Nucleic acid binder design. Structure first.
Lengths: 172, 211, 159, 60, 61, 58
RNA sequence: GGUUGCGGCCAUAUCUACCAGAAAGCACCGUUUCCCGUCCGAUCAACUGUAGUUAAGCUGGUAAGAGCCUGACCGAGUAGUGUAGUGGGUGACCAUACGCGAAACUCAGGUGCUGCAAUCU
RNA sequence: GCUUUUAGUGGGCCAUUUUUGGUAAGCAGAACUGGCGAUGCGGGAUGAACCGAACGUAGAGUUAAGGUGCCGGAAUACACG
């Protein structure tokens, strides 16, 4: 949807005489800003409890940062998405540097591989894999080998002019 | 003389059944709806497989008859006559019309043409209760049904115990307790409400301590 | 041909409200309607005399003429680009008082009392109504109420 | 301004005194390709809560 | 700010007060408007595109 | 030579050009159709209290 | 508190099967001259409260009672539905955004309340 | 708020949603709203109705819908597939 932020939203139903201090549910929401995050909070909390935006109240809305934003992590993501003729559960694995960054390439991947837009995807659980050999997918196992090296063949240089005068070279 | 089914694929009209105003409908092509071993008990066939609709449409009675014939034929020739119970879960009550034709659209109200079961998205059409080990056979027996129906269907394994509405573990819990009593092709359950005098008349096997 | 009789299209309107059929109760005949009373029109199906037209079912007007077994009710009718005033001589079985004027006359006694109580105690009465004002700031405690983290649910069939 | 922001006992008269603000189009653009869906769906209309300032200071 | 921080210190959550005032900008032009929003937009003094007003927040607004 | 039969199109836009009007209620509405036995006496109730109020300015 | 007369709301009051009812009242009950009505003093009319009785009515209680009433983050914020998009899909249709929002189901509780007058261990 | 007087009109059509007959139709007929007729402008190459926006004569700025390889004003932009 954008370059994501991760917000915890805490909300409850409004207090009545019979129930003061209600039970205070909490969700971790990936959204672009705090406006969309409080919409996605009531979108899922209406899918789990008898509440809505009118019978409830947003208690706190806080942005969560990656606790180590510069450590490369292997994230296991569980997705519930809607196809053209049904709904499915998926498990994809994403190697990136933050929970923010793994979700932003999750929506780019689900829109490319399966044509799933933001309205069709319920992210169930973004969890980080701590141990190697717990990585289940082979497109992430490629980068966990000891002493990873590879070249980037066929380097194409972007030109600042409309005419080059020598020839292009494609070495690296 | 019969129009192709694409003329009547969608629910374009209001439900127009056989009533005291219609009165001049043809008979339905499908007549029976329970095939296989319908005399079987509940505990004999734990696994239930559905063939669930996925489109809001109408299925003609001719199509239900052909798919019934195809599924029963395959299931009987592969796994015997009495290893399954097939129940057709739709009944074609809606009457289709036709404007059979100097006058053009003057007086264009049509005569009854046939019957159709009006089906929604997610409505099961067939349901086959069977043994667990018969499973894939029943699966293929529903898959060959899929070719006789317009629109998209999907086979779906029920999490219930045959044709009842409780889960296989929860039916197991009521079965190892006393609360299940047998019947002809179904089962009757014990209610915690009702007259306690004749709630022990039925269900004697309850009320002691255990199984 | 078309049919536009006096009681056309009234199958369910003058129906008698299941398991409340039969004769009507006697507090219908004991209400006192004064000239100026605001009434609601709900046609009793079992009294065929003095019924209103089906336009006036659910319509609310004022009483202009009070006679033996009926009252005269003034209803405005929307017709064309204007409103006309309609006079209806309806029996009292097809009528009842409005409770929305019971909102008013009880709030009149409340408003007139609060003006007198504020006049003796500290005027700045402030006796208007106000809409639903937005909520105030508050502090909600997590003591005994630690927030449970709810996640979206995977897809299951369950049929 | 004090009878606007703190909404006063005389908000109605002070606000009805103010002629409606003939704002311009935004100077930075709207920030969206398509205006007419919700702000939640990536458009313009609806509750844009504190970001209304980012609108109005470019439209003012 | 201090009520927020002194609720965070106390093991609580200071909710803010609900906002008492909105600013509304008419975003759509004149043509093809149904009668009910057109009547409301005449009542909120928003009779042309990119015009704005302040609105006191109650349920009736 | 068939044609359109009936439509209610533009009839509400027409009715709100001149802005559909209320019937302009008055103080002292007409006693037309009011019960004549009440209405006969109300002539004498009003005439007697005019004679009695003009008697206050004798 | 019981009971009667007149009621109000008209099942939380109805229905089915049993158990209890001190007092008063009510009732069943005794008689057929008169007024009165009957194929028939059974209904109805009249006479006495005398010969008898709580057996029935009536009132209350019991029942994992049927029915009905109420409530619920029970089902379910489901189905449906107002508004919106140069959203998805060949279509059938379906997601999303701002809103409103059931019914069945399930569980739990309940099983008449009250006005005016009179009377009662 | 009220009144008088008079013109033209009394062939309509389309779009979203609801909806009837029909296998359907650029079909026939309804309901509510918005348009076209009666209306030019920017976009959809082109088109009565769609999208955007309604118009005195001009200048500057900003945008809408739509677009930015070239025709063609404007990134042979960046990012993941």
């Amino acid at each position: 949807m954008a370059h994501f932020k991760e917000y915890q939203v805490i909300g409850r139903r409004l207090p009545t005489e019979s129930v003061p201090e209600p039970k205070l549910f909490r969700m971790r929401i990936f959204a672009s800003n705090e406006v969309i995050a409080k919409s996605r909070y009531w979108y899922f909390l209406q899918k789990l409890h008898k509440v809505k935006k009118a019978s409830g109240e947003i208690v706190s809305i806080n942005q969560i940062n990656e606790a180590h934003p510069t450590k490369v992590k292997n994230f296991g993501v569980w997705v519930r998405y809607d196809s053209r003729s049904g709904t499915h559960n998926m498990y994809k694995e994403i190697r990136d540097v933050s929970r923010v960054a793994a979700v932003e390439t999750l929506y780019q991947d689900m829109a490319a591989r399966h044509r799933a837009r933001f309205r069709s995807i319920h992210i169930l659980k973004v969890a980080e894999i701590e141990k190697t050999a717990d990585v289940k997918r082979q497109y992430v196992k490629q980068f966990l080998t000891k002493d990873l090296k590879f070249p980037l063949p066929h380097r194409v240089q972007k030109s600042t002019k409309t005419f080059s005068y020598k020839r292009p070279s494609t070495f690296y | 003389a019969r129009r192709p089914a694409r003329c009547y694929r969608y629910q374009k009209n209001k439900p127009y059944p056989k009533s005291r105003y219609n009165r001049a409908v043809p008979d339905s092509k499908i007549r029976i709806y329970d095939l296989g071993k319908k005399k079987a008990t509940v505990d004999e066939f734990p696994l239930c497989v559905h063939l669930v609709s996925n489109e809001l449409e109408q299925l003609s009675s001719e199509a239900l008859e052909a798919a019934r014939i195809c599924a029963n034929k395959y299931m009987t020739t592969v796994s015997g006559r009495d290893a399954f119970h097939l129940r057709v879960r739709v009944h074609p009550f809606h009457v289709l019309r036709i404007n059979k034709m100097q006058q053009g659209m003057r007086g264009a109200w049509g005569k009854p043409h046939g019957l159709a079961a009006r089906v929604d998205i997610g409505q099961i059409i067939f349901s086959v209760r069977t043994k667990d080990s018969n499973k894939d056979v029943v699966v293929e027996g529903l898959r060959r049904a899929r070719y006789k129906f317009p629109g998209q269907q999907k086979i779906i394994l029920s999490k219930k115990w045959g044709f009842t509405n409780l889960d296989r573990p929860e039916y197991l819990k009521k079965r190892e307790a006393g609360e299940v009593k047998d019947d002809g092709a179904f089962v009757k359950f014990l209610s915690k409400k009702g007259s306690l005098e004749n709630n022990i008349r039925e269900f004697p096997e309850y009320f002691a301590a255990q199984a | 041909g078309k049919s536009h009789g006096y009681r056309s299209r009234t199958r369910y309107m003058f129906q008698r409200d299941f398991r409340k059929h039969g004769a009507v109760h006697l507090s219908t005949y004991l209400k006192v309607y004064k000239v100026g009373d605001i009434v609601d029109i709900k046609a009793n199906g079992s009294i065929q005399k003095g019924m209103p037209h089906k336009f006036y079912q659910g319509k609310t007007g004022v009483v202009y003429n009070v006679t033996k077994s009926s009252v005269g009710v003034i209803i405005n009718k929307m017709v064309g680009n204007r409103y006309l005033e309609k006079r209806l001589n309806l029996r009292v079985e097809h009528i009842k008082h409005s409770k929305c004027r019971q909102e008013f006359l009880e709030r009149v006694k409340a408003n007139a009392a609060k003006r007198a109580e504020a006049k003796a105690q500290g005027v700045a009465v402030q006796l208007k109504r106000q809409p639903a004002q937005p909520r105030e700031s508050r502090i909600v405690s997590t003591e005994g109420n630690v927030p449970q983290t709810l996640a979206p649910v995977p897809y299951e069939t369950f049929i | 301004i004090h009878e606007i922001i703190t909404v006063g006992p005389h908000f109605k008269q002070a606000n009805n005194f103010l002629w409606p603000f003939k704002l311009s189009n935004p100077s930075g653009g709207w920030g969206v390709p398509r205006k007419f869906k919700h702000f939640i769906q990536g458009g313009s209309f609806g509750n844009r809560e504190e970001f209304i300032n980012k609108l109005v200071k470019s439209m003012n | 700010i201090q009520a927020k921080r002194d609720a965070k210190a106390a093991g609580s959550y200071y909710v803010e007060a609900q906002h008492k005032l909105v600013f509304v900008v008419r975003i759509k032009g004149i043509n093809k408007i149904p009668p009910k929003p057109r009547k409301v937009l005449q009542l909120l003094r928003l009779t042309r595109i990119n015009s704005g007003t302040f609105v006191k927040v109650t349920k009736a607004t | 030579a068939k044609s359109k039969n009936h439509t209610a199109h533009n009839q509400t836009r027409k009715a709100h050009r001149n802005g559909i009007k209320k019937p302009k209620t008055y103080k002292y509405p007409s006693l037309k159709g009011v019960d004549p036995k009440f209405r006969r006496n109300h002539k004498h109730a009003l005439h007697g209290t005019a004679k009695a109020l003009a008697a206050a300015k004798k």
